[PDB]
Amino acid sequence: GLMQFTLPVRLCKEIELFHFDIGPFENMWPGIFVYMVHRSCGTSCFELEKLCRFIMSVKKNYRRVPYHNWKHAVTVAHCMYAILQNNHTLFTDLERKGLLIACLCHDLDHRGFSNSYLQKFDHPLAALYSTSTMEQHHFSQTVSILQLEGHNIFSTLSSSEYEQVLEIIRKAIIATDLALYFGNRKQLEEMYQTGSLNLNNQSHRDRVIGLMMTACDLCSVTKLWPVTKLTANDIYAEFWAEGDEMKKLGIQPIPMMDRDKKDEVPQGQLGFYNAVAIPCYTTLTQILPPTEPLLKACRDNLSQWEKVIRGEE
Numbered sequence: 063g064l065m066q067f068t069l070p071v072r073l074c075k076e077i078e079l080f081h082f083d084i085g086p087f088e089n090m091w092p093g094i095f096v097y098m099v100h101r102s103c104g105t106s107c108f109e110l111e112k113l114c115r116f117i118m119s120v121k122k123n124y125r126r127v128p129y130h131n132w133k134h135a136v137t138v139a140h141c142m143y144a145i146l147q148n149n150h151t152l153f154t155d156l157e158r159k160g161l162l163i164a165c166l167c168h169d170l171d172h173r174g175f176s177n178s179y180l181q182k183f184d185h186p187l188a189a190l191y192s193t194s195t196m197e198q199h200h201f202s203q204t205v206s207i208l209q210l211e212g213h214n215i216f217s218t219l220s221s222s223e224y225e226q227v228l229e230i231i232r233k234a235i236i237a238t239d240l241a242l243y244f245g246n247r248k249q250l251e252e253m254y255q256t257g258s259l260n261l262n263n264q265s266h267r268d269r270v271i272g273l274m275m276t277a278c279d280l281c282s283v284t285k286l287w288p289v290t291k292l293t294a295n296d297i298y299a300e301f302w303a304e305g306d307e308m309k310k311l312g313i314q315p316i317p318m319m320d321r322d323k324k325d326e327v328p329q330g331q332l333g334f335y336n337a338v339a340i341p342c343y344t345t346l347t348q349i350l351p352p353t354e355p356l357l358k359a360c361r362d363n364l365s366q367w368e369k370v371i372r373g374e375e
C-alpha cells in the first residue's frame with residue numbers, strides 16, 4: 063500500500079507529455095503502465111498482485127506482429143493517461159479505471175489483418191461478429207482474461223459498478239473500429255456547434271470517450287517526426303502483408319496495402335492526416351481544450367509528410 067512505482071528523472075518528466083515515447087526496453091512497459099494507473103487513478107484503485115498478473119496475461123495475448131503489438135497497447139494507454147491527467151475533473155472514478163484498462167486491452171490477440179481481410183478470407187470470427195469483427199474479439203479476450211483466477215482487478219466494485227466499468231470498456235474498445243469513427247465525430251461536430259453537447263448526457267459521454275479512444279489509438283501521428291516516421295514503417299509492413307494475402311485470394315488489394323506501390327505512401331499519409339487524424343484532434347480539442355498539443359503535433363507531422371513529397375527528405 064506504501065509501495066509507489068517511480069521512474070528515472072527523464073521518464074518521470076517526459077511521461078506527462080503527449081509526445082512521450084515509451085522506449086525500446088519491453089521490460090519497463092509494465093512498470094510504466096502501473097505508474098500511470100497509480101497517478102491517474104490511485105495507489106488503491108487495483109490490488110497490485112492482481113494488476114501485475116492481469117498486465118502479464120494481457121502482454122502474453124498480444125502477438126509478435128509489426129504494429130498491433132504490446133508496444134502499441136502501452137502507447138495507446140499512455141495517450142489516454144495524458145488526456146485524463148490534463149482533464150483532471152471531467153471523468154468519474156469508474157471512467158479513470160475503465161479507460162486505461164480499455165486502452166491496454168483494445169487490440170488483444172490482433173493478427174495484423176483488417177476486418178475486411180477477415181471477411182474476404184471467411185475467417186470464423188467474421189461469422190461470430192458481422193461488424194467490428196476484431197474489436198468484438200478484443201473485448202471478448204478482455205473478459206476472458208478478467209475471468210482467469212486471480213486476474214479480477216475489479217473484484218472490489220459492486221455488482222452494478224462492475225457492469226458499468228465493463229460497459230465503459232466494451233464501448234471504448236468497439237469505438238477503436240475506425241469505420242465507426244467518421245459518423246461519431248460528425249455527430250460530435252454538430253452537437254458541439256449547435257451547442258447541444260452535454261457531458262451529463264450518458265450518450266454524449268459515450269461519444270466523447272469514443273473520440274478519445276480514436277485519438278489515443280492514432281497517437282503515432284502526434285509524436286516527434288522520427289517516432290512517427292519509424293512507426294509508419296511498422297504500420298505499412300502489416301498493410302503490405304495483408305495486400306500479399308489479398309493477392310493469394312485472387313484480389314488486387316487497394317494501393318495502401320500493395321508493396322509494389324510504396325511510392326504512393328507519402329500521398330496516402332496526407333489523405334489520412336486530412337481525412338482522419340486532423341479532424342479527430344480538431345473535434346477533440348474543441349471538446350477538451352487541454353488536448354491541443356495532440357492537434358499541434360499532428361499538424362507538425364502533416365507538414366513533415368508534405369516535405370517528404372516536395373523531395374526535401
Ligand SMILES: Cc1oc(-c2ccc(F)cc2)nc1CCOc1cc2ccccc2cn1
Pocket residue numbers: 279280281282283294297318330331333334337338
Ligand atoms: C488506414 C487508412 O485509412 C486511410 C484513409 C481513410 C479515409 C480517407 F478518406 C482517406 C484515407 N488511409 C489509410 C492509410 C494510412 O493509415 C494509417 C493509419 C495510422 C494509424 C495510427 C497512426 C498512424 C497511421 C498512419 N496511417
Ligand SMILES: [Mg+2]
Pocket residue numbers: 168169196238239
Ligand atoms: Mg484495433
Ligand SMILES: [Zn+2]
Pocket residue numbers: 134138168169238279
Ligand atoms: Zn489500436
